[PDB]
Design a protein around this ligand. Sequence first.
Ligand SMILES: CCc1ccc2[nH]c(-c3cnnn3C)nc2c1
Length: 105
Amino acid sequence: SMHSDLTFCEIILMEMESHDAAWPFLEPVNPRLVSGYRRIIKNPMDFSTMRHRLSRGGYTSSEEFAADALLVFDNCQTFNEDDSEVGKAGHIMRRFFESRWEEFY
Ligand SMILES: CCc1ccc2[nH]c(-c3cnnn3C)nc2c1
């Protein structure tokens, strides 16, 4: 299970999930709602997958956790136009994440 040294990552992820701009990223991009996603995006990532991976010990380091957070935002900017609702949400969430991360790094 999660090592206590990563509790700060657990908190950041919780805070991300609570943000209104997080709605596109809470669960895996859902083929019932979004077509052609995995055709383009080879490494999907979302906050629920991160939350479960973190809790079960699937992140050894904060670097691995942050890499998955950045994958959420990188995938979003690959798939979505910057002026789309989901594209804008991704940029909000990247800034929110980086601002919390930079309190530690
Ligand atoms: C469950 C509600 C919902 C509906 C549409 C969505 N679209 C995206 C998304 C994420 N990254 N790219 N897209 C297009 N998340 C969504 C969530």
